Amino acid sequence: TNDVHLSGMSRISQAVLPAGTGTDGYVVVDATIVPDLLPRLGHAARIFQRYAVETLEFEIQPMCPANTGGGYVAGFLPDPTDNDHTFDALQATRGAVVAKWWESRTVRPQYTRTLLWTSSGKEQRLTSPGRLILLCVGNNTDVVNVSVLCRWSVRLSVPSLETPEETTAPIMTQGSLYNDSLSTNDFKSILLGSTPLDIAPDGAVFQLDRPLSIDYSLGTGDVDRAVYWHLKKFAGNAGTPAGWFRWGIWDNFNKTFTDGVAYYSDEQPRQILLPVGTVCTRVD
Amino acid sequence: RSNRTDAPVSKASTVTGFGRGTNDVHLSGMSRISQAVLPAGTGTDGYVVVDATIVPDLLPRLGHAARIFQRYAVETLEFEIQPMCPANTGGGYVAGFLPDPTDNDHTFDALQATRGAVVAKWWESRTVRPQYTRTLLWTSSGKEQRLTSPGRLILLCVGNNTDVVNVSVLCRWSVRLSVPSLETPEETTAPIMTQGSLYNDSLSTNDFKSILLGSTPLDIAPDGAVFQLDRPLSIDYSLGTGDVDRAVYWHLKKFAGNAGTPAGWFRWGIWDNFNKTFTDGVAYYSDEQPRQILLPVGTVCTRVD
Amino acid sequence: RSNRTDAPVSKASTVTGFGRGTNDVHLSGMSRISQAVLPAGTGTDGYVVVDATIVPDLLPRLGHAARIFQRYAVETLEFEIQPMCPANTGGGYVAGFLPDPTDNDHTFDALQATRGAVVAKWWESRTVRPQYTRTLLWTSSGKEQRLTSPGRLILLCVGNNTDVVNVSVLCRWSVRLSVPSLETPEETTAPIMTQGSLYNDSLSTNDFKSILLGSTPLDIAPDGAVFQLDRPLSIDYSLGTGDVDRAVYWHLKKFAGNAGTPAGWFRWGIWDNFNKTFTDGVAYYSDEQPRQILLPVGTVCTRVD
Amino acid sequence: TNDVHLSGMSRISQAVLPAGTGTDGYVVVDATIVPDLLPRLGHAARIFQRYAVETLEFEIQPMCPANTGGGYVAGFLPDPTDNDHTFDALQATRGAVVAKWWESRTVRPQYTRTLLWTSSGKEQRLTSPGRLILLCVGNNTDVVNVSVLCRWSVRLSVPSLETPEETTAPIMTQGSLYNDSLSTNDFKSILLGSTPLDIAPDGAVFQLDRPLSIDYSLGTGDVDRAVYWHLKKFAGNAGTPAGWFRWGIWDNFNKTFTDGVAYYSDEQPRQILLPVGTVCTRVD
Amino acid sequence: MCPANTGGGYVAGFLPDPTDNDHTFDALQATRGAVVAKWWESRTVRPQYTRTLLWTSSGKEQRLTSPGRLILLCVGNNTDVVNVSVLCRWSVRLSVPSLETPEETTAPIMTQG
Amino acid sequence: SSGKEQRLTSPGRLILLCVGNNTDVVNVSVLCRWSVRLSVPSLETPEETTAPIMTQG
Amino acid sequence: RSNRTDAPVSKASTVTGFGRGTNDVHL
Ligand SMILES: [Ca+2]
Ligand SMILES: [Ca+2]
Ligand SMILES: [Ca+2]
Ligand SMILES: [Ca+2]
Ligand SMILES: [Ca+2]
Ligand SMILES: [Ca+2]
């Protein structure tokens, strides 16, 4: 037949968290479970179209000293469209655990056995069984390094080859970007408020469904609203891990980025340039 | 007694009863989907009386209980249309349940074709026992309605109603919720689309009528129900010396409707979640702009609040 | 076939499936009643960490399901206090569940007396299995809390906490709702009382701090949560030539709290239900008024919205 | 039961390839298999809601003269939203065949036997089983006439009745239109770079979900964007068989086309009006 | 060998391919039997290894003279100095008697730089 | 994965000789129908699967 | 599952298979 059964253990994500930045409600890991996350499955979902998760079992492995104060609540929201980052959402879902930082727990979640499309699509519920969310319960005393290991057993089918761009997971911004909030040539990703975007590697150029509408100067007062789409991550400094996002153009074939005009800084009435739900996808 | 346990650096967390909520709740009941009052002579053939998508938000008790679950599966759906008019009332109604939530068509043939549809005089009640899928649909809203709705009900006037007719489309629902979770009470509603089109020159200085948008729920919305535009609304105005900035608003809400137009009037503005407040922008001022369409047909309107 | 039925003047209504909703729903689950962060050296003996009345509004899933019923009866209540601090933390906590919702007392003796109370070091968890009545309590709010609440939980610092302590008071609840009905989502909350007193000369020109009212829920309220005063608030101002009118406001809400006072500041105003809007009155202006008390101790504050 | 097993042959599409236009990776045929390309299934899917594909066997009939040595590769992508038009993606898919223009081959792909819907929706993944793609390997010495036969055995269900427009299929742009390279009153489909848009019949109008900002002059070096949501298609010429698209207000209520307003293309900053991934839907 | 206050983690694996010279977390974790653990916790790697009669003496290809290689990697950032020992339990079954020279019995090494 | 000898990494090599000169440019495409049987799960780097070349002159 | 083990100052060394080589070899 063509139901290749591939199963293995792999790490979806790893996060380093400094001391004193673990206020309750902070999102350490917010990872949508698509095959692109898992390495071995990532190299095996590009040669198949449809997969069915038959066994999923996350295990959180933090590596911090025993004499540390702080907890981590971990859960698996079965709805990928759900974007709740509160303790209530996790405590509601089955399989959630809470434990001290030096502890390693196992999350036995509630997923769906239905066939799912490896390739990304408009309506996410056909492409992911859910999202894993790990929150701090209290302020951490020291730096904590956490690795969310994942044990999976999928059943791929429908042979086909996919570009690496297609298999990337799209993440919607959690915040609203306002016109007065912009800087001269970029903006911090804290305004977006999405942890996957915050921890995105530097240079990961994204494309935004919502048209970023920066006004460009007409010379004397007159305002014309330019529309720019492509955004590039710019490395987060020590003070601000969020990095920055310079607007512009990312050529598909040429793989080259462009920097747009400086934000039109004047008495413009406040507008929503990018509301919550602004999908960003790695074109790189 | 036991006193031989040494004191370690830290003790294992003992939060055992966690993530063990009940999964299955076989909720049931009956409720009124819609109620309409057809004036005499206005029930011309083809007029749509009730056009209601059956999502777990129309049903009130289910609406307040689908927010504590994620996936429901309809197990018994049986609509019961009840008119209230004397036997002297002349005219007929056809009732059906399209199993496709995206099938937005209003004709006698489309309704009659579907299994379980009924045709009856206005002075006679009926029961629509329709065909509905048992698959685990999703409670929360999504891009596609077909995964979040068993179907929609349509009621049409067959003849010409002689007198005013009061019709109530009751529904009997027996759902089986599952997959425990805590959905947010907003973003649990149903997306709505603009059947009509909104023009730049169809805008007033500050407001704009909902009947232009062509969607009945937009025409009847309580004050304070702030809607969300997926597509940007680029209002025109004079920022300075005729500075026509395409001010982008995504947030539309129904201020106190104008008495002249019962369908009422939206404003464009900022709906801040951190403040949960609606702040209005610069009033529309068409200075020098060729005619254009701002909100095209199909612009999805979901109510942020 | 049957065709022998004559046509009467009107036919009997055939709405049979009416008023037949399910009555019993054995809802269950676990949730977090409260979570507190005690700073070092501020956990002096007698300080109240958690003081929470257990109404079906603290429990979220029950809160969204007690609005579709009227009378619930608690069948299993077992609070599970969980601290999170290393073994080097010095100090102790006492936890209890007063079965009398009106018993507003915070002492070690009162807590320890009640059955099921526990005393333990801050680095050790406990389980409070309390005594609770099985009588059919009422979901909706009323004049007396004793018919709408099994009791209240109190947590107290026994010693002096050496370091900051993060404590979470979890609760396991297994209620049995009954008497189907559709309670309004507002007026389902719990009434709150002003432990402190609000003076005429303790009022600013426009605002007044919540910490003066002496009630913690009043001190921490989201912006837009409009409260109701059972007792009138007679603000003073100069209507004309020093016209000191005792302007009566019953509606108090928390505008954006002042950064200086985290407890924040209410305004007096009109909360119109027909518009669902807060309109502010004339700013307070103490022109010539001897000192007085406007909102005395025990003024019930229920949130209209 | 209500199942109706219809089965019959039909010609998916007819394509004309001008002499010498067979550039590298040129898409001769890009046809989504919706129940309209098949005429009998087109008339028989208007009376049902759910259809499941039980058999699908394509066949190429290149009527190109045997003198031309240009090559063709044929494949069936099982993902309707898949916008990959590369040789590797085709050849990986089951049943893909490569030959020359004087040779005719068949395609027997691996479809998905699930209950698709017969009416258009937000995502195509529940409405179509896939899409036939036929690339031209090398340039053609002679004009290539291509006819692709289909052998389908669907299994309809859920009786109903629908409208003709409800069975239509959306289109996606494979290229990024640029402001600096734009005709004043129109533009050809070469900028869009989508084969269905290349062969788009004259009279069809496509709605851009992205803001179609046409930047008309306010005067004195000041310009203003004008947002539109329609694209009327006009026939082009022999030199450029791509055609033309003009913006404006295709007011379907009046069925009148406001022509493309003047585009003041003098100093517009380099932007992409429609970045890669922009979609177009024939309003009809 | 470090106290419980040591912060950091290690991943251990046994690549069955002696020529696979790659050092990443994913490559190690993929192989069967790999472990991930904090620095203050021991582990046992029970790996997959071929039973074929490998050759003792060195040759052109290592794949006929080695069951595989072991890799140990630092997952986090070690807070203090950590002393790690990679013990091994082996039960071989020698055969084909002969007298190999003691030199040319060692293992070839390659210049990465 | 690549090694010192190709005899444990590949099953063989396709060779296609041209018997005589071509009057026209010859475009050749060689299709393969393979049914492999993988085992021993792991993960590798792209370069490790490359193949060496030998000079015939 | 077992999660009731507290975290001590240090854990006992678990090097069990030590000093257990074969003694007799009839070469
Ligand atoms: Ca795909
Ligand atoms: Ca949801
Ligand atoms: Ca009541
Ligand atoms: Ca349909
Ligand atoms: Ca040898
Ligand atoms: Ca290898």
Automatic annotation (TrEMBL), chains A, D:
Subcellular location: Virion
Keyword Metal-binding tagged: yes
Keywords: Calcium, Capsid protein, Metal-binding, Virion
Main localisation: virion
Metal-binding among keywords: yes
Gene Ontology annotations for the cellular component aspect, listed alphabetically: viral capsid
Binding sites annotated in the UniProt record for Ca(2+): Q49, D79, D82, S119, E162
Family: Belongs to the peptidase A6 family.
Protein name as catalogued: Capsid protein alpha
Organism taxonomic ancestry: Viruses, Riboviria, Orthornavirae, Kitrinoviricota, Magsaviricetes
Full-sequence range covered: 52 to 335 of 338
TrEMBL record, chains B, C:
Organism: Dragon grouper nervous necrosis virus
Top-level taxon in the UniProt lineage: Viruses
InterPro entries per the UniProt record, alphabetical: Nodavirus_capsid, Viral_coat
Binding site for Ca(2+): Q70, D100, D103, S140, E183
Locations listed in the record: Virion
Name recorded for this polypeptide: Capsid protein alpha
Source taxonomy: Viruses, Riboviria, Orthornavirae, Kitrinoviricota, Magsaviricetes
Keyword Ribosomal protein among record annotations: no
Keyword annotations of the record: Calcium, Capsid protein, Metal-binding, Virion
Family: Belongs to the peptidase A6 family.
One GO CC term on file: viral capsid
From TrEMBL, chain E:
Locations listed in the record: Virion
Residues at which Ca(2+) binds: D17, D20, S57, E100
Transmembrane regions: none
Coiled-coil positions: none
Entry similarity comment: Belongs to the peptidase A6 family.
Protein name from the UniProt record: Capsid protein alpha
Provenance organism: Dragon grouper nervous necrosis virus
